[PDB]
């Protein structure tokens, strides 16, 4: 029975407790009293005193008594009661004849655990497995003795230690003997393991660092209690362990280990930095090289993970270089590694380096040469956005000023060599307001003056419109830059020392900067002397002057113009001559606006609030000026023809102004109340055919655009966009300036405004019913009688039709409908009518055919003879109410006959129409010949002279 | 920023460390310095001194400062740093204006854990949640103060305690202040919880017992260090807690709890038993009632589990009643609960109760009345197999003797009332040898004598053969029972005092016991005086005497027969008269064996080794006796007819011995070498027809058995079983006893052995070729000449055929073949033959027809006249070599004629055959009539007298 044998062995131990036994026998006794599992509660006490005696004897054994694989199972059995099988294999071979409920067993195990805790077996086990004496190695590395290292640092022993560290006996670390000293010697033995494995290698370090990390994690609360020199010892042990590292990966891992250590042992950055600055610089260089390589590159997922770790390592060491006293070290760091560090697109580390630079500057005055070197090296790099940080790092006012001027010169040079990348960087740098706030609270006045001068120089030297525009805008901002110390004019023209002719070029750039790029509030209107001295300006600065001439009215504008243009002779005379009644400027601006509306061309005036253009002329106060209103009606006329080109779906300036004007006067006006439906059919068909012929004459892109725009063919109006609504709105508003008193302004018959009024009275489409009724009322004021009111309206319509045919598919149609409206009218003639009234109904017929001039004869297509022959031919056909019509026409022809002679041009078939004159003379001689004789003879004489 | 506010609060604490603050403010400060997570390694020291100050102040707070649900999260935060959300909800409502890496946080948490360990916050938390002072309740139950209990024992507080017990602060139980005292007060507070929840209830106890078990599991190593009175306090606390339990389930659970406790606190059975015997008895009664109910019965799987537990509870408490000093208690336990405990079919608990009974008997002398009461109560129960255990428990020799005699009387009474169950129990009890070894080493001689007397009484009084057989066998065993003290005759006939006529009946029971039940070695042959005085015995004890008469030859048998039959007059005369030449016993035994082989009946002689029966007669020495050999040949003859009944597939004694005997002599013997193939066909067909007629006359079971046995019909032999091989083997062996000298024994012609020898010489099938050639050689010795050798063989065959037809479908066939063999033979007759030789060839013809007796005439079927008429008829047909045949037959008939007159019986058609006599007389008178005249006249005179 095993229990009896165990009892006998226990008795043998109790009576032989003062004797010394070989370790093998002790191990055999231990094994045999563990393997028994049928113990009783009665004999537990004697056996526990037995095994405390055995454990006390075992601790006294020399370390070389057993091997680690035999040391392991005995501890297993005496701590948790687990029995390893190969252990029982080895132990059953030992003879012991010379020495001869599970609750009892677990009580025995726990009591043995308590006794093993009291007698401190863990230290003995560690010393045995590691083949070293922990106290001796701890003492020797207290004394820095590294050439006499005697310890096993094999990976499997590290595995065994790690497999130890997790049981519960270490949960009670503050209960074993000299637990602080034992803790210290464990820490130093782990450090000596790292040292041994580092020295041997002169996968290889993973287990060592792992077991060291586990040891420090379990041991931090007790290392700092007894020995206050632990921190310094860790500092020296690593100040070698770093220096013995061959490769950079090793270095970064172990520096991570001491980042951890300084975290555990509560070591602030100041002490470590002041005691390890020399090696730290090398370590920093190697690790930052690793960061650079890993950023360049940025089982294959590790390439990011390690990246993060290494970066965090920097984040720690820079935080340990927070109070780095060596200014030279941090200066050379900024000079060499900071550029690429910024290039790594990492902000935290740069950010901290910046603050430690500012702290080093506050505590110590670094040489200006060093700081200008680092600034230029940063200026050299295409990173010019963060430079302001190191500019704020400049604690010297003079250095700050010189650094700012060097940086501005550098960006000027960057814009000079014309590389897109640098230009983009400069644009981003000038997109923030904190930069300019810092520039204001750093730089002084002279810096602003030189910046303005150089910057106007680059603006005038820049051919690229974008670069010049940016230059002018930022020049405007630096002109209005408020200095904090001085808290405004910052650049004067005299200091620029530039020729005036090139300063004249800046006007367009100023237009672009002040209305295109900038908003209304931040717009800073300025005018170069080319504008202030001339009226013959392009519409760009014409619009500029018209819309920012209110800015000179304010005292601020006049003041800054005077102070900026100070030193230039005659400036006062210029100012008074533009304050003087600019009226010609208004005329030319409105003329250009008229012709630009006449050609269907896009202009930036449309983007402005032109709908209240009448308000604009009210701001200056020339709304009462009469010479403007003429031009005003011109505007109206032109917008009218624009509307026509909108309705025709024609677009483009392929036809002259008068053609489309007379086509506009050709519309729904009461002139076509008299016409019949067959007439409409023929005119619409011919208009559609000629419009289609024009359409297929165009290109494919224009046809696609017109098809997209047009929802329906003639006469349906195409789709309406937005801008035409604005144009129409301001067009109808003109009436605000058309009041012009009661009747006296329009009483002059021979005025363009009178022609406009006659046009608007009857049927102009683009004008709304309110304007139409106002025009009708004012015409009622002019002509109280309605008979003359309609007579003059009809005469105006026909006369406009006739005059429009002077400067040449549409002319022939107009010929046709002129004939046709005459045919319609002829039914309404009275027998008692006069020849002058008939000529008036025919238009300006008498005055039209009496214009005998060389120019009128020149290049005429014979429209006059063509008309005369056409009506004469139709009346001749009728002759071969009707009698009254023929008689009145014959009266008219007899009255006019003596004038038609001068007209026959010598280029057209003059003789053919001379012969064709036979019908009119026949209808005259049917009755009239007796009263009109001299005319007849003179007519014949010039006719024969023509031969 | 929370960190600045926490720093300010920490400063406020440091300058106000000597002031007292309300607990709410302290909790708010704790919460706010926990919630901060951006701490620095620099300020860790000041904050840890801050919270040690706060914890020291908090410990000083009165227990009613907070509620448990507020006490919980603060401990959570200060031990593991986990923050409960509702806690932050409650704490954020407190204003603190008047007081104004995660590695740092975890260091803070671990340092706070260490400080909380040092200041012992766990005791304060327990006192707060349980609304009690642990020291006061521990002291009061040291002083046994139960009427002033003030504690909360709610289930949720138990849940909270259990949820506490598992963190790591309790891993260091030996580090908090007064950890032994705190351990004691925890144990006593848990006990007071059980007490409170037991008293309140005057599901309800599960959490309390669970938390108590967890507490004792974590707290056992420290409860016995300081206070040595813990064991007694647990004893009293349970000596009430058991006594206050209303139901038995509660009782069994809590007694399990103290089985556990005595296991943990190292309390041996002796102390607990001597201090708690009164209540333990009640507890034992209740739990054993539970075991009885659960055995009777033996989510529904629990009915077994609890069962086991409760049984284990008994296994513990009985082991704590090991040294129960009260003999009355254990005696009454055995008297009342032990029977049903045995009935529970559980052996461990009974087993231990038995040993504790023996220990109580060794230490203390229990009254004999108690032990006889418990024995009779066990004897009363049908469990009489284990009684021997309590008989060995009897330490008193006189009591042991009286208990043994009471038990034997009890089993005698059990066998008397004739209930099968009790008989089976007695048989099982007598099936073991340890029981009889114990009976021998316990009882004395007089016990054996009275057992033998009563047991012979029951054997002779038992009508059941099985009960009597068991009685006789066990009487034999108790007769040979060796007593250890006396170390053999144990029962004598005189003491039995039984009448001799009933003792004569025991013979058959002795046969059954000594050859059927018992083996050869343990067979104990005995013979009742009925056998020793008589020869007219049934074959049972005949076989017994023949096979165990060797047992008297040994001195042992004679000695035990004399000493057992001592006191009976004339025993010596009986012994000498059976030692005297038993020869008649042999004759009668062999006669019975012969007739039993003749009827195909199963007998147990077959199971014996009868194959060496010749050896048996050699053992006695009567193998030389001549009067046996006659009977021997009888045996042979009978086995022969048995073989015939085997070959015929007939079986059963439906035909007489002589019929089958003459059919056996009818077989392949040389008598049928003379017969031809048509004769074989007719005889085989008729035999098959009559055999089938016999077959379908039988029943279905016999036909099924015969069909299974017979693999083929006639003449193919059926399948051969085993026993016939044995019978045939001993049959052939007879020859060993047939040597009988050279020629002188068989020289007597008129002997049965001579008939057997004549039969074996020619053709008996069952005898092998060795016996056949031996018989031929011995017949060559008897008859050197071969002519007489074949003549007598032929005469024997025909004479056996004729004699077999005297005591009547097979007879008519025999008639036919007798005629037919005569026809065959008649061709071999010489002209010079004599009438006597011809009669010899015809068989015993002359001697056969001359037997004139009243018995021969009586009931004769007229076979003689039938034969005479049949051959006379065939020879008459031939008459109407042939002449020689007719002449020889006529000579024979003339010689015999004067004798055939006497035979005609008066029951059969006598006159018809008298008339049919005309053919023989005709063939006689064809020639012979002159030499035979007086015969003719006498024949005619008796013929006429017959009329």
Author numbering:
A (entry chain A), B (entry chain B): 2 to 101, 117 to 218, 229 to 324, 364 to 552, 561 to 654, 657 to 883, 890 to 961, 972 to 1018, ...
Copy out sentences from the published article reporting this entry, exactly as the authors wrote them.
Among the >600 human ubiquitin ligases, UBR4 plays a particularly important PQC role, being an essential and conserved E3/E4 ligase found across eukaryotes. Aside from teaming up with various ubiquitin ligases, UBR4 activity is linked to two specific cofactors: calcium-binding protein calmodulin (CALM1) and KCMF1 (13, 16, 17, 20, 21). Our data show that the evolutionarily conserved UBR4 complex forms a megadalton E4 arena, in which inward-facing ZZ-DZB domains of KCMF1 act not as E3 ligases but as substrate receptors. The architecture of the E4 megacomplex is conserved across eukaryotes, but species-specific adaptations allow UBR4 to perform its precisely tuned quality-control function in diverse cellular environments.
To explore structural differences, we determined the cryo-EM structure of CeUBR4. Although the nematode E4 complex preserves the ring shape of the human enzyme, it displays notable adaptations, particularly in the dimerization interfaces that result in different topologies of the ring-shaped arena. Whereas the domains aligning the N-terminal ends exhibit different, unrelated scaffolds, the C-terminal interface is sealed by distinct interaction with the two co-factor proteins. Proteomic analysis of purified CeUBR4 pointed to a distinct substrate preference, with mitochondrial medium-chain acyl-CoA dehydrogenase (ACADM) showing stronger enrichment compared to SSBP1, which is preferred by the human UBR4 complex. In line with this finding, we observed well-defined extra density in the central arena of CeUBR4, closely resembling the elongated shape of an orphaned subunit from the tetrameric ACADM complex. According to the cryo-EM data, the bound substrate not only contacts the ZZ domain but also two long helices in the N-terminal region. These two helices, which are unique to CeUBR4, protrude from the rigid E4 core into the central cavity, exposing a series of hydrophobic residues that may help to recognize and bind the hydrophobic surface characteristic of orphaned subunits. Organism specific variations illustrate this principle: in plants, specificity depends on an internal AtUBR4 ZZ motif, whereas in nematodes two elongated helices at the N-terminus extend into the central cavity to capture substrates, presumably recognizing the hydrophobic surface of orphaned proteins. The functional importance of the ring architecture is emphasized by its conserved shape and dimension in CeUBR4, despite pronounced differences in its helical scaffold and dimerization interfaces.
